[PDB]
Write a protein that binds this DNA or RNA. Structure first.
Ligand SMILES: Nc1ncnc2c1ncn2[C@@H]1O[C@@H]2COP(=O)(O)O[C@H]2[C@H]1O
Ligand SMILES: Nc1ncnc2c1ncn2[C@@H]1O[C@@H]2COP(=O)(O)O[C@H]2[C@H]1O
Ligand SMILES: Nc1ncnc2c1ncn2[C@@H]1O[C@@H]2COP(=O)(O)O[C@H]2[C@H]1O
Ligand SMILES: Nc1ncnc2c1ncn2[C@@H]1O[C@@H]2COP(=O)(O)O[C@H]2[C@H]1O
Lengths: 200, 200
DNA sequence: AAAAATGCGAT
DNA sequence: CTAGATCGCATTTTT
DNA sequence: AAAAATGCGAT
DNA sequence: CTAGATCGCATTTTT
């Protein structure tokens, strides 16, 4: 779209290698991010260090928008890179100015926030209403419908650790591994290492 | 603020008695709400009918904003009145027009969405990281810091059923009642019926 | 060759 | 009862 | 006088 | 093991 090259034209483009940190929880927020290319993960932590992924984010997504509305706000979560990234970055102070010339970009953001709120809420009912099995099941399903999913003769093929599915459904990596074995025991999937074939 | 009487001036003011439904899950969303007075509850459901409160909302809060950004969107949750209410209502079609004359009101909304996303996320870690006891504890604490909380000689006094705390922390009313007894067993609170004194 | 991820499995 | 978290390391799977 | 909310407590 | 969900109704607490 037209207003994109414009917005982009006023941003600092930065790169972040996979596994790195773009945003740190608790720090003063003054910057806005826009993923130009790559995937990141939004995570929160417990006192011990156990992580909980709240979302994944991709091209076309803004990051660090939450601290843009109320003075002296802190980052609400850690944001780490899943792959290599190319993020457009801009100063809140700056951004505020762009949306005056054109509030339409502010709209584009608010929409995202709306979608985000929808899914988080959806994620709340999930933790409240489904048991691990169901949560893992719904996850392999979502994962398989993703574009980065590999096409395989018996269904779709994904790659991910028991550990990370655990940080997604909110359980222990041990519980994942066991539910996994059961889902295979029931001929629903077929896992070998990080590779899981979700049968169709 | 000035832009308020303005926005308000273009809304239909409606009243809703306590226990009633302002928004129904799954229906076509075309209206925006603004709580002028009163408290509501945002809830989602499981196939059985068990409810899960995602939030409470008060004066100064917008409701039904999520379906305002993408064409043909459906309400994401039920919104029910906790008390009697006076809600300002307006057509999305209309609203869209007000934020052109003044995108500043759109800002006010987006902020709310930001805060909402923060707390829901906070609520996700809670379900993932805390056990019922801890969740109930954090809840009586929050409830007691609320303005509608009654001031009592030994601390703060709140009124609420075991059933509803359950729909808040996401557990069975039976589990609430038992944790309650334990918290009293430990001289932390003192419950008699819907009344609970959270000792200070 | 390492660093990460796993599973044990009886509590 | 039913569903999950633990634990310290050696064994196995991935960068 | 009802309608709602509770607790049983052994599984 | 530790933490929670169940179940059908009579008893108790609230509108
Ligand atoms: N309730 C939870 N219990 C345990 N781990 C959790 C929870 N919620 C999120 N997690 C995280 O998810 C991870 C799954 O695998 P791990 O056992 O290695 O470590 C777990 C934590 O880091
Ligand atoms: N629940 C969520 N879902 C999706 N993205 C989120 C969520 N919570 C936080 N984020 C993103 O992660 C960012 C962390 O820092 P900010 O608070 O600046 O802004 C946050 C959002 O961009
Ligand atoms: N995981 C859950 N298990 C049971 N009830 C739940 C859950 N999440 C939300 N709830 C709701 O919270 C209510 C608490 O009291 P009830 O047992 O009457 O009914 C429960 C459901 O309506
Ligand atoms: N997680 C949430 N926290 C707070 N309010 C919410 C949440 N999810 C939905 N709502 C509100 O409830 C409304 C239900 O209908 P809408 O989707 O129009 O818009 C929704 C929001 O106004």
């Amino acid at each position: 779209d037209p207003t994109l090259e414009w917005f982009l034209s006023h941003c600092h483009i930065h790169k972040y290698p996979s596994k790195s940190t773009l945003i740190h929880q608790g720090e003063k927020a003054e910057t806005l991010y826009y993923i130009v290319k790559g995937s990141v993960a939004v995570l929160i932590k417990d006192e011990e260090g156990k992580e909980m992924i709240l979302s994944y984010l991709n091209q076309g997504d803004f990051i660090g928008e939450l601290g843009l509305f109320e003075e002296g706000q802190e980052r609400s979560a850690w944001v780490r890179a899943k792959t290599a990234c190319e993020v457009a970055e801009i100063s809140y102070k700056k951004f505020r100015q762009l949306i005056q010339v054109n509030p339409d970009i502010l709209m584009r953001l608010s929409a995202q926030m709306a979608r985000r709120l929808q899914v988080t809420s959806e994620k709340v009912g999930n933790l409240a209403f489904l048991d691990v099995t169901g949560r893992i099941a719904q996850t392999l399903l979502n994962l398989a419908k993703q574009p980065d999913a590999m096409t395989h003769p018996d269904g779709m093929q994904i790659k991910i650790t028991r550990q990370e599915i655990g940080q997604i459904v909110g359980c222990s990596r041990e519980t994942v591994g066991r539910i996994l074995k059961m889902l295979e025991d029931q001929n629903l999937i077929s896992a070998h290492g990080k590779t899981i074939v979700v049968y169709g």
